[PDB]
Design a protein around this ligand. Structure first.
Ligand SMILES: O=C(CN1CCN(C(=O)c2ccco2)CC1)Nc1cc(C(F)(F)F)ccc1Cl
Ligand SMILES: [Cl-]
Ligand SMILES: [Cl-]
Ligand SMILES: [Cl-]
Length: 223
């Protein structure tokens, strides 16, 4: 708690989207973005990161899923916080399953550190998921993954990875290096990289339209 921001389905939800915001934010802005592309049968859940000290910014307390120590290829990542946060997301997936939405009808996603967390959670959980929408982010703890395919429940998971070509905070190059790594961890036929010309560390309407088409293709209406 506080309770996640929820976009209810218009009718009993047969699928769900769990979207994780980035550093400094809450789930409200992203909930309004998903409300503008909402499908009648999908529930959208945007949980709020706890407020915690961020090492990168002199331990200033701000909403963050885990600690951030640096932005360069050699920078250390918060292994314990990332794993802890991923088990918390797995518990939210579990709640949705027990409450009637199978995990193969759930898409996980996020922006920046939230996107990184969504990839890490999807690529470690054995709860089969429908897909991932990874926006302006990177694969965290990349060296801990195998050198080949991950195997397991989510070996054929569909992933939409989005990036702004003018991102001044998460270089396009880290988005590209991440998708090249995702194409070796899972079936590459279901991994798609979309880039938005002129977009910085932000979102845009064309990206939300591509996210909507991906969500609708993977979580179509069912009888
Ligand atoms: O935490 C990190 C660590 N970063 C190391 C460098 N890296 C890779 O070399 C790479 C290539 C493929 C996968 O990883 C990405 C991760 N970064 C980050 C955080 C923020 C924000 F959280 F503070 F906002 C912003 C921007 C950045 Cl880059
Ligand atoms: Cl419902
Ligand atoms: Cl972030
Ligand atoms: Cl349906």
């Amino acid at each position: 708690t506080p309770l996640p921001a929820i976009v209810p389905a218009a009718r009993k939800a047969t699928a769900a989207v769990i979207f994780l915001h980035g550093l400094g934010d809450t789930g409200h802005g992203w909930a309004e973005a998903f409300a503008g592309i909402r499908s009648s049968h999908i529930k959208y859940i945007c949980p709020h990161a706890p407020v915690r000290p961020v090492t990168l910014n002199m331990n200033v307390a701000m909403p963050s899923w885990f600690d951030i120590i640096g932005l360069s290829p050699d920078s250390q990542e918060d292994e314990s916080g990332i794993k802890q946060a991923a088990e918390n997301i797995k518990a939210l997936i579990d709640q949705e399953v027990k409450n009637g939405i199978p995990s193969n009808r759930i898409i996980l996603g996020g922006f920046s550190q939230g996107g990184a967390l969504s990839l890490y959670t999807a690529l470690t959980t054995q709860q089969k998921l429908a897909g991932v929408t990874a926006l302006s982010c990177w694969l965290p703890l990349r060296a801990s993954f195998p050198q080949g395919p991950i195997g397991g429940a989510n070996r054929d998971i569909s992933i939409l990875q989005c990036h702004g070509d003018c991102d001044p905070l998460v270089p396009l190059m880290f988005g590209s290096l991440t998708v090249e790594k995702l194409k070796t961890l899972v079936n590459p036929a279901n991994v798609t990289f979309k880039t938005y010309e002129g977009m910085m560390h932000s979102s845009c309407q064309q990206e939300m339209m591509d996210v909507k088409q991906f969500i609708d293709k993977l979580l179509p209406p069912i009888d």
